[PDB]
Design a protein around this ligand. Structure first.
Ligand SMILES: [Mg+2]
Ligand SMILES: [Zn+2]
Ligand SMILES: [Zn+2]
Lengths: 99, 1335, 83
RNA sequence: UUGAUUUGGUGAGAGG
DNA sequence: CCCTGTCTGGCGTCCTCTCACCTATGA
DNA sequence: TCATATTATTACGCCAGACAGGG
């Protein structure tokens, strides 16, 4: 099985799972620890922001690849803003501070 | 873009500021059409239009007026994702307190209003009343009231009196709670009391009272008044395949809260009576509490069928919340997965990758390449071209592959060598071809395994895959110094068959002018691959400074050793191939090649090793047959001699001469002896079976048996497995844990019958159950370790210290187990090591000890090295580059940046699978004696007896290093003395552990002081001997009239005056303990070394109990202060022990549980770190008593003992840094001139920078005290709540952070993996240097 | 061609700054405007960057010198075109 | 402006 | 009032694949 | 079809952490 780009889920902006659903590989927790074990800071940054979740990042990246410019414009993951709204939907005021 | 994440409470004004419209109706959707509800949960005006830039109902179907809201639609006009960020709010009719601040253990409202949880819930569920500023009545403010208590009060205090209930009353209490006022009171209460329990109970209440005043969190924000609703997009309502909507659980929760709130508003309209609106508000309280955190209240609500439905807190917490399932691990585009296979033609920087996966993973690069050439125009055309797969896109694909690495990943990645980057080579096929040597890194066999491929998209990621994660760059395991590209199984058989010899072959003893014609004689058919031969080889030894000097000579060698010499690079000597080359020898061949010639010859030489091993293993034809497993001819007579022996033992058992346990022990002993004899018979019969003549009489050699080369080469097989295929397969054990007395005398070449196979299945089912349940604890151990580490990044170059732990070789009592060169390899010395002669600067004080320095250490026989350890590093927030050590997979020091906490945590937890889950001293060598911790005396006979319990007996050799060590008890008969030379095997120690010696220092006469027969001691004349002994009783058997009497022996002179201790003016009286029996009676003159009484008496969960720092059930008790010791009160729960120091203050004591067999007498002076009883010892006692270096030596020795018992090589840096992360918190003792509190627990770097910026001023600092937290308590007690929330319980940590108003200055690895940016360790450490500089 | 980056790690001795210097250079060649300082054997911009690093003609100092030279050239171009 | 629903959740079994 | 059983909560391995099954009521 | 709103099973194993009881 292989996936470059196709459909994703509803709640989250990450790719679907499986083969019958044309989906990508779950880059799990211990693989993130293995990339932290190297100096792979940029590989991990595209591994969890551009390739997976951030919608503006992935559309800009697809257009940047097909122009011939391997460069990522990262932004913030969508599932973290989903986390902010689920935590904030309690009586909890979680924010994002100064520039 | 943004610094720290701030968490605080949500005010009702803040919740109305989040909101965009009140969600009234609970009606979800229409359900018969497609439209929602106006205005229900899924509204239009409150949130937004379903369709993008459209009024859902009807107006604006173009792009001109985005925003207009007509009365016929009551709809906003924006994007489809606008509803995902917009949230609604439910105006709760009746106030409802939060469940996270009422049941968090400890509750936030429980230790703030000074009221028990039980009483808080009673009033909260409309079952109890609470007073609130009554007035001039006889009632308190916190005191509650019941129906009867209120009824009577109602008729009594009908006027000025307030007694409400529920959240409303609670809210008022919190609202009317002067925070500041309580502070002073609490502070004054803590300074006006001495109660230990109260002190801790008051310090925990004042800590959460002053923390609330420090932030902008109000006391009335605990109760929920304006409940917030999560965005619809985040609670999606999609239908499955069919005609119904599979609705989420949160829609059930919100719809019930809104149904109940509408009912409660209608009842407060209608003025229903009291009990109706109490049940109505109570059902609303339980509905809100079920929405927020379901199931924390009594049994959780359920929709379909009996399974409870999932609430908001269950969208956060757990293995499947947002942290562990969508933020730490994500699903990933440009990724693939398939079954692996070998492909041995590869070079070790490249892997095979199928054409179909390659054309799917590289669709955008192919699109960009196709658009560059000009073959097509629009993007559609290119997608049709690769959907059709024409003849021109495969050249495009070979031009996008070429220099573009991919990340191969095996699915259980345990350490960092399980993600490696290759270059693709395209494969006709559907299976990833993976280079074989690399398999030993992935733990990948080829029995059905699968791997995932990931594509580095951007340019920095291609460079990170080539420069950090390439497979040529990972040739040493980061856990140690051992190479991980060791040749595994076929190739060592090909080498072991190639470089060997036989006593006659084709071309025996002919002479050859080079290795080239050695291979030419092997190929043409004129010699054999193993035929001993003088060749002329030219080995290049590089003895100058970087210059290779040729020396050519004639080596008496074989043909195969010359053929393998054609592949060895220049610098290695010929003697690396002159031996037989098993697996350990080829591993040290690649290791010496890496240490001498560097990286590139070692990569190309690893490939040439693998190619020549595969080729000559193919030419070998090394099969396995049924005749290869040679049965010993002596096996049947050994079994019959064992059968005669068990017959003799059972004939004694019929006549009852021997006991049953001694029978079972004798049967297990003779079957162990017969098993060892059968193994030696088959091992001789395999290791030297070949006996071939050469030009005359016969001559023997090691065998070319196939199973023996598969065992001796170390390819696959050991002694035990080849033992079970030929000799008997031992004594298998039943699942009771005890062994079975009748062994399995049949191997596998003979047939096992039925019972023997069933006993075998006992033994093997236990092993499969152990692995399949062991793997969960191994993985959870790696998780706890990488979440306690998680932060620690090499961030300096020198901390500027002179402290470091004292690396000695470790010695258990056998031969010296782990040499000093294994422990001080590549670790930077603390002070400069003196040469063992006299005062020489052998090595300087900041040199890395690589192999050349360690060889000059081994030549001089250096005792022990004071070396720098990670736990002694002075760097605030990180570890400096010298106190870590060598890079371990790079030859140099650790770079500024490389995350060492994560590689250390992986290197400790990765061998978690291989670990298991469930008289006197006899010297061995011949050397010199030395004693430490010794205070001794010469007895009458001459044997130096010892008056100290804790004496260490070292055996030092003639060179200076310490070769043996032992522990000698109090009062043992030493055959030798101090500084003496002995012989190998001579007994040097003797004692009796069943009889605790009460030996003396001086001589004289014996008097019975406080020894009265009848109450103190008893008369027990011996039965079978007649020589009686006055038996000393204990303090429990005698009655209360004489229980105060302490029996003792004090030595006098010939007159009767007390003979004093030499050095003091005190007599030497020995107080006899309980259960003693007097050996030497009254009037008998004594000497030293003679007793005065007879006193009769682990694998992987050990690694968990060392890092998590549990206490053992019966710890060894110690002394918190030095000085004289005494006893106390007679058995009220415990038996007291009072320690009065010589110069220090007296009042320390401890109540010992009296079930322990003590070690100390009444006239004994103790010390800190000195034992009082025996058994295991808790690490907190080591930390608060001996020192920090003592507890780090304790953990690294007690866990390298597990990792060495199971045989795993791990360097000690990893355990020292997880020990650093254990003892990172501290507690204050004297607050000093700072802003801390008395017994406040604060982290160590904070208090050290505080009193280091105050001590640089005039003010003297604060004196701390370090504390050792276990790894899950230490990773949950962090100054970064996302780090402590991605890990275990999120409810406790988020309420603690919310009511404290905590802020997360990100500054670690997992905060930046959550929030989606660069890691502040690796390549991103320059980015975080830049961002930290530009503030 | 490329198998190991070991000489490039020798000449920029940090092993984490090699990625950043070669990424800055390979972005100067990819989008980029610039042409390489080394003959190209149909290698990509990654391997051409690292291959420039190995022969000791690109490091961080040379790239900052070239960008100051381009900033001065743009300054002189703006001044000599306007005034 | 040129198209669409599983993830959700349970249970059972399997691979490494 | 300092030990103490006793009770309550909170953990318990990653990755993947196949299949089936999904609230009652009701004038 | 369109609002009404929650009951008759037990069978893990530590391991911390808080709580009423009593010498
Ligand atoms: Mg396997
Ligand atoms: Zn409209
Ligand atoms: Zn340091």
């Amino acid at each position: 099985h292989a996936r470059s780009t196709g459909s994703y889920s509803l709640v989250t902006q990450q790719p679907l799972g499986g083969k019958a659903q044309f989906g990508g590989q779950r880059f799990g927790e211990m693989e993130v620890w293995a990339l932290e074990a190297y100096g792979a800071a940029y590989t991990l940054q595209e591994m969890l922001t551009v390739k997976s979740d951030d919608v503006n990042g992935r559309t800009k990246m697809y257009k940047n690849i097909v122009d011939g410019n391997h460069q990522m414009e990262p932004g913030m993951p969508e599932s973290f803003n989903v986390l902010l709204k689920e935590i904030r939907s309690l009586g909890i005021n979680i924010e994002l501070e100064d520039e | 873009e943004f610094d720290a994440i701030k968490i605080a409470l949500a005010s009702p004004d803040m919740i109305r500021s989040w909101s965009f419209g009140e969600v009234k109706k609970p009606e979800t959707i229409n359900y018969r059409t497609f439209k929602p509800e106006r205005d229900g949960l899924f509204c239009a005006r409150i949130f937004g239009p379903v369709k993008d830039y459209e009024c859902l109902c009807g107006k604006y179907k173009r792009l001109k007026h985005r925003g207009v809201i007509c009365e016929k639609c009551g709809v906003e006009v924006t994007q489809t994702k606008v509803r995902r960020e917009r949230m609604g709010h439910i105006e709760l009719a009746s106030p409802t307190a939060h469940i996270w601040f009422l049941k968090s253990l400890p509750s936030r409202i429980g230790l703030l209003l000074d009221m028990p949880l039980r009483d808080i819930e009673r009033v909260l569920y409309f079952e109890s009343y609470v007073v609130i500023e009554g007035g001039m009545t006889n009632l308190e403010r916190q005191q509650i009231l019941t129906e009867e208590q209120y009824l009577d009060a109602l008729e009594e205090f009908g006027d000025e009196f307030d007694a409400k209930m529920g959240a409303e009353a609670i809210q008022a209490l919190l609202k009317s709670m002067d925070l500041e006022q309580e502070c002073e009171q609490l502070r004054e209460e803590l300074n006006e009391t001495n109660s230990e329990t109260k002190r801790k109970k008051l310090t925990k209440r004042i800590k959460l009272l002053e923390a609330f005043v420090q932030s902008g969190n109000k006391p009335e924000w605990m109760i929920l008044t304006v409940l917030p609703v999560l965005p619809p997009d985040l609670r999606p309502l999609v239908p499955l395949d069919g005609g119904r909507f599979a609705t989420s659980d949160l829609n059930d929760l919100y719809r019930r809260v809104i149904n109940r709130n509408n009912r409660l508003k209608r009842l407060l309209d209608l003025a229903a009576p009291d009990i109706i609106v109490r049940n109505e508000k109570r059902m609303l309280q339980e509905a809100v509490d079920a929405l927020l955190d379901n199931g924390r209240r009594g049994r959780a609500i359920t929709g379909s069928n009996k399974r409870p439905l999932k609430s908001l807190a269950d969208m956060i917490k757990g293995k499947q919340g947002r942290f562990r399932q969508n933020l730490l691990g994500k699903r990933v585009d440009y990724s693939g997965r398939s079954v692996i296979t070998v492909g041995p033609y590869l070079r070790l920087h490249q892997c095979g990758l199928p054409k179909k996966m390659a054309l799917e993973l590289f669709k955008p690069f192919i699109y960009g390449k196709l658009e560059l050439r000009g073959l097509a125009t629009t993007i559609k055309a290119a997608k049709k071209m690769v959907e059709r797969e024409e003849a021109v896109v495969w050249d495009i694909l070979d031009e996008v592959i070429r220099e573009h690495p991919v990340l191969l990943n095996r699915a259980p990645t345990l350490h960092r060598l399980g993600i490696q980057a290759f270059e693709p080579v395209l494969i006709e096929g559907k299976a990833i071809q993976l280079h074989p040597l690399v398999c030993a890194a992935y733990n990948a066999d080829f029995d059905g395994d699968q791997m995932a491929v990931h594509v580095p998209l951007t340019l920095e990621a291609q460079l990170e895959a080539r420069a950090l994660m390439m497979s040529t760059n990972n040739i040493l395991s980061p856990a140690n110094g051992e190479p991980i590209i060791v040749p595994s199984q076929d190739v060592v058989l090909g080498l072991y068959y190639m470089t060997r010899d036989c006593v006659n072959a084709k071309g025996e003893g002919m002479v050859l002018t080079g290795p080239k014609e050695a291979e030419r004689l092997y190929r043409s058919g004129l010699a054999s691959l193993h035929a001993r031969v003088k060749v002329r080889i030219t080995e290049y030894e590089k003895d100058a400074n970087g210059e290779l000097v040729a020396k050519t000579s004639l080596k008496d060698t074989t043909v195969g050793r010359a053929i393998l010499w054609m592949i060895v690079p220049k610098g290695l000597p010929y003697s690396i191939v002159n031996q037989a080359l098993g697996k350990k020898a080829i591993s040290k061949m690649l290791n010496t090649c890496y240490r001498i010639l560097g990286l590139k010859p070692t990569v190309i030489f690893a490939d040439q090793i693998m190619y020549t091993g595969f080729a000559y293993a193919a030419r070998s034809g090394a099969s396995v047959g049924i005749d290869d497993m040679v049965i010993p001819e002596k096996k049947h007579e050994i079994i019959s001699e064992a059968e005669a022996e068990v017959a003799e033992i059972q004939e004694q058992f019929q006549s009852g001469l021997v006991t049953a346990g001694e029978r079972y022990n004798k049967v297990i002993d003779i079957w162990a002896a017969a098993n060892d004899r059968v193994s030696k018979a088959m091992m001789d019969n395999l290791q030297t079976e070949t006996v071939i003549n050469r030009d005359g009489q016969e001559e023997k050699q090691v065998s070319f048996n196939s199973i023996y080369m598969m065992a001796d080469s170390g390819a696959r097989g050991s002694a035990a497995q080849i033992r079970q295929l030929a000799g008997m397969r031992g004594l298998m054990a039943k699942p009771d844990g005890s062994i079975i007395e009748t062994p399995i005398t049949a191997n596998f070449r003979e047939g096992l019958n039925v019972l023997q196979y069933f006993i075998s299945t006992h033994g093997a089912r236990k092993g499969l159950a152990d692995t399949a349940l062991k793997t969960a604890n191994s993985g959870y151990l790696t998780r706890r370790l990488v979440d306690v580490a998680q932060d620690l990044v090499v961030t300096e170059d020198d901390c500027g210290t002179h402290e470091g732990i004292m690396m000695t070789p470790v010695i258990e009592g056998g031969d010296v187990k782990e040499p000093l060169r294994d422990r001080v390899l590549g670790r930077v010395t603390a002070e400069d090591v003196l040469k063992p002669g006299t005062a020489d600067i052998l090595v300087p004080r900041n040199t890395l000890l690589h192999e050349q320095w360690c060889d000059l250490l081994e030549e001089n026989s250096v005792d022990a090295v004071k070396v720098r350890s990670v736990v002694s590093c002075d760097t605030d927030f990180g570890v400096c580059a010298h106190c870590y050590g060598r890079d371990l997979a790079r030859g140099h020091i650790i770079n500024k940046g490389e995350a060492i906490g994560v590689i250390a945590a992986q290197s400790i937890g990765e061998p978690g699978t291989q670990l298991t889950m469930r008289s006197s001293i006899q010297v061995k060598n011949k050397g010199s004696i030395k004693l430490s911790n010794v205070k001794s005396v010469v007895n009458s006979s001459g044997k130096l007896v010892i008056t100290s319990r804790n004496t260490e007996l070292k055996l030092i050799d003639e060179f200076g290093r310490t070769k043996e060590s032992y522990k000698v008890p109090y009062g043992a008969v030493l055959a030798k003395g101090d500084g003496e030379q002995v012989a190998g095997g001579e007994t040097v120690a003797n004692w009796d552990p069943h009889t605790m010696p009460v030996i003396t220092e001086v001589s004289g006469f014996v008097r019975f002081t406080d020894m009265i027969d009848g109450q103190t001691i008893t008369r027990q004349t011996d039965e079978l001997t007649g020589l009686s002994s006055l038996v000393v009783l204990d303090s429990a058997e005698r009655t209360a009239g004489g229980k105060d009497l302490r029996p003792a022996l004090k030595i006098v002179d010939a007159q009767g005056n007390d003979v004093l201790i030499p050095g003091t003016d005190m007599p030497a009286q020995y107080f006899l303990p309980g259960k003693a029996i007097v050996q030497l009676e009254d009037g008998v003159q004594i000497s030293s070394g003679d007793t005065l009484a007879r006193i009769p008496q682990g694998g992987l969960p050990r690694v968990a109990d060392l890092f998590e720092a549990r206490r053992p059930k019966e710890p060894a008790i110690l002394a918190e202060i030095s000085g004289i010791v005494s006893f106390g009160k007679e058995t009220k729960g415990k038996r007291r022990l009072v320690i009065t120091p010589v110069d220090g203050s007296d009042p320390y004591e401890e109540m010992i549980p009296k079930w322990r067999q003590l070690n100390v007498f009444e006239g004994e002076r103790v010390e800190r770190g000195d034992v009082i009883s025996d058994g295991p010892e808790a690490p907190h006692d080591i930390l608060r008593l001996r020192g920090v270096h003592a507890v780090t030596r304790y953990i690294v020795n007690e866990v390298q003992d597990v990792y060495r018992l199971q045989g795993v090589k791990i360097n000690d840096k990893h355990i020292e840094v997880i020990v650093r992360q254990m003892l990172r918190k501290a507690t204050i003792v004297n607050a000093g001139s700072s802003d801390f509190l008395e017994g406040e627990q604060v982290e160590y770097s904070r208090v050290k920078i505080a009193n280091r910026e105050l001590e640089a001023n005039g003010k003297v600092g604060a004196t701390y005290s370090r504390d050792l937290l276990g790894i899950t308590k230490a990773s949950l007690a962090t100054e970064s709540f996302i780090s402590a929330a991605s890990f275990q319980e999120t409810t406790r940590v988020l309420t603690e952070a919310a009511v404290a108003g905590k802020r997360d200055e990100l500054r670690g690895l997992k905060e930046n993996v959550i929030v989606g940016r660069l890691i502040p360790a690796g390549t991103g450490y320059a980015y975080h240097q830049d961002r930290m500089r530009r503030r | 061609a490329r198998v190991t980056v070991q000489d490039a790690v020798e000449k920029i001795g940090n092993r984490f700054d090699l990625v950043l210097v070669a990424a800055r250079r390979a972005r100067q060649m990819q989008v980029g405007g610039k042409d390489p300082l080394v003959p190209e054997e149909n290698d990509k911009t990654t391997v051409i960057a690292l291959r420039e690093i190995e022969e000791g003609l690109i490091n961080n100092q040379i790239l900052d010198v070239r960008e100051r030279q381009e900033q001065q050239e743009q300054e002189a171009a703006e001044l000599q075109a306007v005034t």
